[PDB]
Structure formats: structure tokens, C-alpha cells
Amino acid sequence: SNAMVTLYTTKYCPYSLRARIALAEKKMSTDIVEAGDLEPAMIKKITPNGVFPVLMEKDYSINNRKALLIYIDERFPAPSLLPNVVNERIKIRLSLDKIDNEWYPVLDQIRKHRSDQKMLESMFKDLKESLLAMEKAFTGSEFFISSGFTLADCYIAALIICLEAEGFIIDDEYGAIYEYKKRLFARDSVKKANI
Amino acid sequence: SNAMLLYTKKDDIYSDIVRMILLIKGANAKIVDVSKEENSKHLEELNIITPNGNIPTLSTDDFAVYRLSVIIEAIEDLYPFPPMFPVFPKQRANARILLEYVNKTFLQNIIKLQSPDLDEKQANEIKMLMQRDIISTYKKIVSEREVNAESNPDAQNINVLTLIITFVFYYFIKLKISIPTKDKNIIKEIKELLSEPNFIKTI
Ligand SMILES: Nc1nc2c(ncn2[C@@H]2O[C@H](COP(=O)(O)OP(=O)(O)O)[C@@H](OP(=O)(O)OP(=O)(O)O)[C@H]2O)c(=O)[nH]1
Ligand SMILES: [Mg+2]
């Protein structure tokens, strides 16, 4: 139709929530088409390898997860979702690989190893310590490792929404991190993606 | 002052890519070959500032970044001239998507083949996987380069993918892997591709 881009998403996927949170922050007019709501034949036409989400424009289509949000940030420049200072931007760009490779797989391990009797219980405890041992390491900044809302916050919000549907909820016990969680969910970009 | 310290190892294709890019940027960097015995003091500091003594690692007074896709980005922030990427978001996305493919298909496997514990049957199946896709990969790199140069004839930027693939070919030969192509022109291009002055200076 008249929408600038069409984002084909899949339910309960952090890579789909990431795109939505960013496309909302940019205020780019988007049409959101949920996966599974398509014909099994068309699902193979949009993405031949069933990799979601998919972002389509008139002349271009992209579904690479490691590079999607970096494209949304460069394609729609304002507002900038990367830090303005060089040293700060060089680090966020590394923490993005850290999050994708160190913290997103643990979500899959909560879905995959939900088949082990007492494995989930051991995993919630490990993830809990990983945070509490980090709520003290990080404090005194509005957003994740920066003064402004960044791509790292989209990565994390999407991860927070998906864990929160798997039973792992962030309580007062995460204090510094819980206040950071309350500010994240207050933003309109993260709010449209949570319902 | 321009402190920049780059941790590397000899005959490491990753360290050869970053060193060549620092050379093209004319950036002030101090190369440290952690393989050499005299540099044992630096290696100790390396296992301190990186989770696994990652190689290579770009170390400054402020940060320590270790992935190739990250290092190339960081280098672009510290030294923008000349630019290594195109100007249009589509082309930049494709260059990134292509860098990931070349890293997982070739760069990661070139490092597996250098393992002294790799079984002979696996090594040979690894070299054949790389031989099936190298030509098709090189054609796409050139394809994206011709598009980006034509879309902005005045931008006059460098194609990092061409720089990375040059080292793939180089390590193909180093490891006795055949570049499967009877095309006379591809051999000429590869021939001139390995003859660029900045590439000789790196080896
Ligand atoms: N030795 C070495 N490896 C590099 C370098 N740059 C990238 N890589 C390796 O290549 C693998 C994937 O590279 P990426 O292109 O970043 O893809 P990814 O983020 O989805 O994992 C990674 O190993 P992996 O098996 O996927 O594990 P992990 O790193 O994702 O934890 C990563 O360690 C480098 O400079 N030196
Ligand atoms: Mg990985």
C-alpha cells in the first residue's frame, strides 16, 4: 500500500520485537504483517529460508539479523540510535555482538531445555546471579551505557519482553536494573511492541 | 599519545586484514605479535583485557574491541579517510551481509585448517567446501563493487570486501588450495589483486 516499509514478524521473537521497537522510535510508517498469518506458500516467497523478521521496501528487502537494525538506523537517520561520541559508539557496537551471542542464546536455552526436569530452575538462578552481579556493576545512567536511548536498549527490551513471557520476571531485587526496566517500558516505542 | 595498540599473531588472516586497513588509513598503531616470545609481557595484558585473549584486538587508552566486524567499524570511527564503506544504506547493509558470509565460510575455516589436531578427513572436506563457493563469492564482491562505484562516481571509496577477499586467495595458495577457475580474466584480476602495493607491504 502506501506504507514506507512492511515488516513481516513472527510471534514471541526478540528479533521481531527489536525491529518494531526501532521502526517505532524512527517514526517510519510501517505495515506489520504477522507470520503464520500467511499462506505456507507465501512464507517461502518472502523469506525462502524462514528467517524472520523480514523488512521490505520498494527496491530492497533484508532479513539478516546481525545487520538489520544497523540498517534501520542508517536508512532512517533521525533520531540517531547510536551514541554521538566516538569512544562510546565503538563500545555499543561491540556490546551488540556481545548481546546477540552471549545473552540471546540463553533465551533459546530456556525454550529448548524446558524438557529437563530441574534444568529451568538451575537456569533462572544462573541468569539471576548474572544480573544481580551486574546491577551493582552498572548504575547512574538513564539508558544502557549511554545518555540516550540506543540500539542496545532495543536489543535488551526485546529480550526482556521475551523472557518475561517465559516466567523470568524482573523484580525489585534487580534494583538498579529494575528501574532501568521501568523506564524502558515507559517509552512509547517499547510499549507498542509489548502488546 | 595516539596510543593505539594492535594485538596480532603471525600468519593469522584476521591480523593481516586489520594491519592492511590500518596501513590504508595511515593510522598510528603499534603492532604486537603475541606469538613472538619477547612479547610475553603483552600477552599477559591481553588475557586481562579480553575474554579469551582474542586475536586480533585493537587496544586504546579507552577501549578494547576484538571482533573483526567490530574492529573494522571502530577503525572507521577513528580514521574516516579514506572511507572503507559506501555511502548509501542499502549498499552498506549488503557489504555487512557479505562480510559475515566471507567470515563464516572462509575466515573461520582458514583458522580451523591451521589446527594441528584437525583430522585429515575433516581438513579435506573443509578445503572442498571453500573451493565450491570461492568463485561465486568473488563474482558477487565484484558485482557489489561495480554497483557502488557507478551509483556514486564521485564518492571514490575503497571496497573492504575486495581487501578481505585478497587475503582469502593469498591463504588459498598458502594452504595449497586450488582456485577452481579456467577463466582467463578472473586469473588476471586475481593476479593484479594480489599485486596491489598496499598488499605486498602487508606480507
Ligand atoms: N579467531 C577469530 N574469530 C572471529 C574474528 N572475528 C569474528 N570471528 C569469529 O567468527 C564467528 C562468527 O562471526 P560473526 O560474523 O560475528 O557472526 P555472529 O555474530 O552471528 O556469531 C564467531 O565464532 P563463533 O563460533 O560463532 O562463537 P561466538 O564468537 O559467536 O561466541 C567469531 O568468534 C577474529 O577476528 N578472530
Ligand atoms: Mg556466533
Numbering used by the authors:
A (entry chain C): 0 to 194
B (entry chain A): -2 to 200
From the paper:
An unusual set of Francisella regulators—the heteromeric macrophage growth locus protein A (MglA)–stringent starvation protein A (SspA) complex and the DNA-binding protein pathogenicity island gene regulator (PigR)—activates FPI transcription and thus is essential for virulence. The F. tularensis SspA protein, which shares ∼30% sequence identify with other bacterial SspAs, is not homodimeric and instead forms a complex with MglA. Multiple studies have shown that SspA proteins impart their function through interaction with RNA polymerase (RNAP), and, in Francisella, both MglA and SspA are required for RNAP interaction. Here we identify MglA–SspA as a novel ppGpp-binding complex and describe structures of apo- and ppGpp-bound MglA–SspA.
The structure was solved to 2.8 Å resolution and refined to final Rwork/Rfree values of 21.2%/26.5%. In each dimer, clear electron density was observed for a single ppGpp–Mg2+ molecule that, strikingly, binds in the open face of the heterodimer with a stoichiometry of one ppGpp to one MglA–SspA dimer. Comparison of the apo- and ppGpp-bound MglA–SspA structures showed that the individual subunits and the heterodimer did not undergo any large structural changes upon ppGpp binding (superimposition of the apo- and ppGpp-bound heterodimers gives RMSDs of 0.7–0.8 Å). The majority of the interactions to the ppGpp in the MglA–SspA–ppGpp structure is provided by MglA. The ppGpp in the (MglA–SspA)–ppGpp complex adopts a ring-like conformation, which is stabilized by a bound Mg2+. Binding of the Mg2+ to the phosphates is crucial for stabilizing the bound ring-like structure, which assumes a conformation optimal for docking in the MglA–SspA-binding pocket. The backbone amide group of MglA residue Leu65 and the carbonyl oxygen moiety of MglA residue Ile52 play key roles in guanine base recognition by making hydrogen bonds to the O6 and N7 atoms, respectively. Aside from the base-specific interactions with the guanine, additional hydrophilic and hydrophobic contacts anchor the ppGpp molecule into the binding pocket. These contacts include stacking interactions between MglA residue Tyr11 and the guanine base as well as ribose hydroxyl interactions from MglA residues Asn100 and Gln105. The ppGpp pyrophosphate moieties are contacted by the side chains of MglA residues Arg64 and Lys101. Intriguingly, SspA makes only two interactions with the bound ppGpp-Mg2+: one from residue Lys65 to the ppGpp phosphate groups and another from residue Asn100, which interacts with the Mg2+ ion.
